[PDB]
Design an enzyme around this catalytic site. Structure first.
Site, PDB file in Angstrom:
ATOM      1  N   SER A 195       0.861  -1.196   0.000  1.00 48.34           N
ATOM      2  CA  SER A 195       0.000   0.000   0.000  1.00 48.34           C
ATOM      3  C   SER A 195       0.892   1.239   0.000  1.00 48.34           C
ATOM      4  CB  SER A 195      -1.014  -0.100   1.152  1.00 48.34           C
ATOM      5  OG  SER A 195      -2.111   0.776   0.915  1.00 48.34           O
ATOM      6  N   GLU A 322      -9.235  -5.213  -3.951  1.00 49.26           N
ATOM      7  CA  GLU A 322      -8.572  -4.081  -3.303  1.00 49.26           C
ATOM      8  C   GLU A 322      -9.556  -3.052  -2.766  1.00 49.26           C
ATOM      9  OE1 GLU A 322      -5.569  -3.939  -2.599  1.00 49.26           O
ATOM     10  OE2 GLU A 322      -4.320  -4.880  -4.148  1.00 49.26           O
ATOM     11  N   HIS A 435      -7.749  -5.585   0.443  1.00 52.79           N
ATOM     12  CA  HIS A 435      -6.512  -4.815   0.586  1.00 52.79           C
ATOM     13  C   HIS A 435      -5.827  -5.124   1.907  1.00 52.79           C
ATOM     14  CE1 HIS A 435      -3.840  -1.504  -0.409  1.00 52.79           C
ATOM     15  NE2 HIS A 435      -4.116  -0.871   0.719  1.00 52.79           N
TER      16      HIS A 435
HETATM   17  C1  LIG Z   1      -6.952   7.293  11.511  1.00 50.28           C
HETATM   18  O1  LIG Z   1      -6.792   7.159  10.131  1.00 50.28           O
HETATM   19  C2  LIG Z   1      -7.924   7.410   9.340  1.00 50.28           C
HETATM   20  C3  LIG Z   1      -7.524   7.314   7.814  1.00 50.28           C
HETATM   21  N1  LIG Z   1      -6.819   5.983   7.481  1.00 50.28           N
HETATM   22  C4  LIG Z   1      -7.423   4.824   8.080  1.00 50.28           C
HETATM   23  C5  LIG Z   1      -7.479   3.588   7.167  1.00 50.28           C
HETATM   24  C6  LIG Z   1      -8.593   3.791   6.113  1.00 50.28           C
HETATM   25  C7  LIG Z   1      -8.779   2.523   5.256  1.00 50.28           C
HETATM   26  C8  LIG Z   1      -8.893   1.268   6.069  1.00 50.28           C
HETATM   27  N2  LIG Z   1      -7.731   1.174   7.040  1.00 50.28           N
HETATM   28  C9  LIG Z   1      -7.883  -0.132   7.893  1.00 50.28           C
HETATM   29  C10 LIG Z   1      -7.977  -1.325   7.010  1.00 50.28           C
HETATM   30  C11 LIG Z   1      -9.178  -2.038   6.886  1.00 50.28           C
HETATM   31  C12 LIG Z   1      -9.280  -3.130   6.025  1.00 50.28           C
HETATM   32  C13 LIG Z   1      -8.158  -3.518   5.256  1.00 50.28           C
HETATM   33  C14 LIG Z   1      -6.962  -2.809   5.357  1.00 50.28           C
HETATM   34  C15 LIG Z   1      -6.879  -1.725   6.224  1.00 50.28           C
HETATM   35  C16 LIG Z   1      -7.760   2.343   7.924  1.00 50.28           C
HETATM   36  S1  LIG Z   1      -5.215   5.888   6.897  1.00 50.28           S
HETATM   37  O2  LIG Z   1      -4.608   7.106   7.241  1.00 50.28           O
HETATM   38  O3  LIG Z   1      -4.582   4.717   7.421  1.00 50.28           O
HETATM   39  C17 LIG Z   1      -5.227   5.775   5.051  1.00 50.28           C
HETATM   40  C18 LIG Z   1      -5.442   6.913   4.201  1.00 50.28           C
HETATM   41  C19 LIG Z   1      -5.427   6.846   2.844  1.00 50.28           C
HETATM   42  C20 LIG Z   1      -5.192   5.621   2.122  1.00 50.28           C
HETATM   43  C21 LIG Z   1      -5.178   5.485   0.673  1.00 50.28           C
HETATM   44  C22 LIG Z   1      -4.951   4.298   0.055  1.00 50.28           C
HETATM   45  C23 LIG Z   1      -4.712   3.142   0.842  1.00 50.28           C
HETATM   46  C24 LIG Z   1      -4.729   3.230   2.197  1.00 50.28           C
HETATM   47  C25 LIG Z   1      -4.972   4.457   2.916  1.00 50.28           C
HETATM   48  C26 LIG Z   1      -4.999   4.612   4.369  1.00 50.28           C
END
Ligand code: A1JC3
Ligand SMILES: *[C@@H]1O[C@H](CO[C@@H]2O[C@@H](C)[C@@H](O)[C@@H](O)[C@@H]2O)[C@@H](O[C@@H]2O[C@H](CO)[C@@H](O)[C@H](O)[C@H]2NC(C)=O)[C@H](O)[C@H]1NC(C)=O
Ligand SMILES: *[C@@H]1O[C@H](CO[C@@H]2O[C@@H](C)[C@@H](O)[C@@H](O)[C@@H]2O)[C@@H](O[C@@H]2O[C@H](CO)[C@@H](O)[C@H](O)[C@H]2NC(C)=O)[C@H](O)[C@H]1NC(C)=O
Ligand SMILES: *[C@@H]1O[C@H](CO[C@@H]2O[C@@H](C)[C@@H](O)[C@@H](O)[C@@H]2O)[C@@H](O[C@@H]2O[C@H](CO)[C@@H](O)[C@H](O)[C@H]2NC(C)=O)[C@H](O)[C@H]1NC(C)=O
Ligand SMILES: *[C@@H]1O[C@H](CO[C@@H]2O[C@@H](C)[C@@H](O)[C@@H](O)[C@@H]2O)[C@@H](O)[C@H](O)[C@H]1NC(C)=O
Ligand SMILES: *[C@@H]1O[C@H](CO[C@@H]2O[C@@H](C)[C@@H](O)[C@@H](O)[C@@H]2O)[C@@H](O)[C@H](O)[C@H]1NC(C)=O
Ligand code: SIA
Ligand code: NAG
Ligand code: CL
Length: 526
Positions: A195, A322, A435
């Site tokens: 990622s 994804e 993902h």
């Molecule tokens: C406190 O943070 C809030 C924002 N983010 C949280 C993630 C959002 C997506 C899901 N993640 C958990 C998770 C569930 C299921 C399978 C894998 C992962 C939590 S982040 O900052 O981490 C973020 C930002 C933009 C991205 C763009 C492209 C890919 C990943 C991204 C992650």
């Protein structure tokens, strides 16, 4: 038990793995703690210590907001930090085989988390299995995330941008200077990441200052050309300024803005990171890599297009579903706790969520491309369409484009399509091969028979572990011994890729051909 590094001695600890032993050094510091006047600056060098540093537990993770979308739920909390947050977080981890190897290939892991979150101490990033099974050395580092790692005032060394990438690069440097004392080969270093970690790996292929610090590269579900991976210099200034306003730090001398931000407590920088962008999406990257004139000397798409990158082999791939993870972080009608059958109007509202600044005609064109049904009566037509939209746009098509463009300059590339849904997956079945859920297979967690994985998943993890280690050691991700399917190089003409599953491992061609012509050729125009 003790190793003499250039900056001092470190003591590690023995671990029992599969009737054998792995030696772990957890929490070796690799930079001056970026505290006080060092907040927002590039990472400064570490001065020697005379004692024995105790690298026997994971160190602090870097400051970061936490996903509280599903408290108590393992599917989300497995990604949340599992050591104290602190600005004092520039540490790395080393797993070495026992008995100490003589000249072992080194695998360096770079975690993802949107450049806003992540830590190397996650259970799914535990390097001990790879060290035990393949006798490679595994290194992983913590690097700064969010505003503390990527706040951008371009040209200004008080906050130049890309600090978290320079954190990563300083750890690669530590491996060059030090890993031979651990039995590693600094001339055989493969970076791997997932990622935003994979996007990071791809940017090290572009950054001239990283070229001498590694050999080969593995990109799992990410690349710098993904639409979330690089912040524009326009947005970066607007975001640094909005953060200033949000914290009462607006000044006219830009350097005085940084000094003001240097007196705020970490928690108040963290709380205002969210609102620096007016309309966010589930994939928003508030503070990420920028073209800083230092790590990154030009727009990365230009560098990619014109062959300005390290010439070496790459391994790249994506997972079958994804996009589904992000639907339950904002798309209306969606829930991990039901089958999320949405209607056409919910699909349309879903596009507004994921593409908020996109013209009406742009959103219609996505709808047009993804709603030409092979059956118009299937209740889940719209649920699956939105998932494919998010995953194709954000991960699959950018990774395929990176691989094509990179291979056109004469290097061997290998591309995989991961389509196994973990038997232990806590998310519902409609979300598919999500993902991030190949990582545990890459790190060999199913090789531990105690952990409720099936036998078919042990075999698959075993073969993946072998292919990843053969790629790092020899530039060729084959499993040569157990009459496995041979993995062909990816060429821009035939575009062969290998599928990874417990059933039949097949060679296929031109993944998502029709979907990616839309995203890659047409959609950039709207
Ligand atoms: C406190 O943070 C809030 C924002 N983010 C949280 C993630 C959002 C997506 C899901 N993640 C958990 C998770 C569930 C299921 C399978 C894998 C992962 C939590 S982040 O900052 O981490 C973020 C930002 C933009 C991205 C763009 C492209 C890919 C990943 C991204 C992650
Ligand atoms: C450890 O091994 C290296 C060789 O590493 C291999 O070659 C790299 C180019 C890369 O493809 C890796 O994946 C390989 O595993 C030895 O490097 C040699 O060092 C001598 C120093 O005098 C030099 O003259 C040789 O040219 C180097 N060999 C190559 C191929 O460049 C190194 O000596 C080994 N060290 C120990 C302690 O075993
Ligand atoms: C660039 O920044 C301005 C300012 O953003 C507002 O103030 C920040 C401190 C932060 O709290 C944001 O959430 C605010 O939106 C943006 O302009 C604002 O845009 C919104 C909606 O588009 C509007 O309601 C506000 O009135 C605007 N305020 C001002 C002062 O212009 C702007 O959209 C940002 N983006 C770009 C591309 O310029
Ligand atoms: C699937 O669930 C979503 C989410 O609703 C929440 O989660 C459910 C499991 C249950 O606990 C509900 O009480 C929660 O509200 C449902 O989406 C909601 O639908 C209603 C009416 O249809 C709408 O007014 C809400 O705005 C929706 N909420 C969101 C966040 O979009 C959805 O209807 C369920 N689908 C099924 C059961 O097929
Ligand atoms: C660092 O650790 C030193 C040794 O720790 C002890 O010995 C090893 C073999 C392990 O069994 C460990 O669990 C033991 O606690 C300490 O003597 C030393 O004080 C430590 N240094 C600091 C600064 O804490
Ligand atoms: C290969 O398969 C092993 C188990 O299968 C047995 O051993 C191989 C070498 C063949 O002789 C076969 O006929 C046997 O049934 C696994 O233990 C081993 O881990 C596998 N290796 C890899 C890299 O996947
Ligand atoms: C975030 C932080 O600095 N944590 C520190 C912890 C805690 O302060 C205490 O255990 C109380 O939580 O104390 C140590 O001595 C330890 O036990 O390893 C050092 C470590 O750096
Ligand atoms: C801004 O402040 C810095 C140090 O505080 C100083 O060196 C610089 O000249 C100032 N520039 C302006 C335009 O005020
Ligand atoms: Cl090298």
């Amino acid at each position: 038990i003790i190793i003499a590094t250039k900056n001092g001695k470190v003591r590690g600890m023995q671990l029992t793995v599969f009737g054998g032993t792995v030696t772990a050094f957890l929490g070796i510091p690799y930079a001056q703690p970026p505290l006080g006047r060092l907040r927002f600056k590039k990472p400064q060098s570490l001065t020697k210590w005379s004692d024995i540093w105790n690298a026997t537990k994971y160190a602090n993770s870097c400051c970061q907001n936490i996903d509280q979308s599903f408290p108590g739920f393992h599917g989300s909390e497995m990604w949340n930090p599992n050591t104290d947050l602190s600005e004092d977080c520039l540490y790395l981890n080393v797993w070495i085989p026992a008995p100490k190897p003589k000249n072992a290939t080194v695998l360096i892991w770079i975690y993802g988390g949107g450049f806003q979150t992540g830590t190397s101490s996650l259970h799914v990033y535990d390097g001990k299995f790879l060290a035990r099974v393949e006798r490679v050395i595994v290194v992983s580092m913590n690097y700064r995330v969010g505003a503390l790692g990527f706040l951008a005032l371009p040209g200004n060394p008080e906050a130049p941008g890309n600090m978290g990438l320079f954190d990563q690069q300083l750890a690669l440097q530590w491996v060059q200077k030090n890993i031979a004392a651990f039995g590693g080969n600094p001339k055989s270093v493969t970076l791997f990441g997932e990622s935003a970690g994979a996007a990071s790996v791809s940017l090290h292929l572009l950054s001239p200052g990283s070229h001498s610090l590694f050999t080969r590269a593995i990109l799992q579900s990410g690349s710098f050309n993904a639409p979330w991976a690089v912040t524009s210099l326009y947005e970066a200034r607007n975001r640094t300024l909005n953060l200033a306003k949000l914290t009462g730090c607006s000044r006219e001398n830009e350097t005085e803005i940084i000094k003001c931000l240097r007196n705020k407590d970490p928690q108040e920088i963290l709380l205002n990171e969210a609102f620096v962008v007016p309309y966010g999406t589930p994939l928003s990257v508030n503070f990420g890599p920028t073209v800083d004139g230092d790590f990154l000397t030009d727009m990365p798409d230009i560098l990619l297009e014109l062959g300005q990158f390290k010439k070496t082999q790459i391994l790249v791939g994506v997972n079958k579903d994804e996009g589904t993870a992000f639907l339950v972080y904002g798309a209306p009608g969606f829930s991990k706790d039901n089958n999320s059958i949405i209607t056409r109007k919910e699909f349309q509202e879903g596009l507004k969520i994921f593409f908020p600044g996109v013209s009406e005609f742009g959103k219609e064109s996505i709808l047009f491309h993804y709603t030409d049904w092979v059956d118009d009566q299937r209740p889940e037509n719209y649920r699956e369409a939105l998932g494919d939209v998010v995953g194709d746009y954000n991960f699959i098509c950018p990774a395929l484009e990176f691989t094509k463009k990179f291979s056109e300059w004469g290097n061997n590339a290998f591309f995989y399509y991961f389509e196994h849904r973990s038997s232990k997956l806590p998310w519902p079945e409609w979300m598919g091969v999500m993902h991030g859920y190949e990582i545990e297979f890459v790190f060999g967690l199913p090789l531990e028979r105690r952990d409720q994985y099936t036998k078919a998943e042990e075999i698959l993890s075993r073969s993946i572990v072998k292919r990843w280690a053969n790629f790092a050691k020899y530039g060729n991700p084959q499993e040569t011994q157990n009459q496995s399917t041979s993995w062909p190089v990816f060429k821009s003409t035939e575009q062969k890729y290998l599928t990874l599953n417990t059933e039949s491992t097949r060679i296929m061609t031109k993944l998502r051909a029709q979907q990616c012509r839309f995203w890659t050729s047409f959609f950039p125009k709207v």
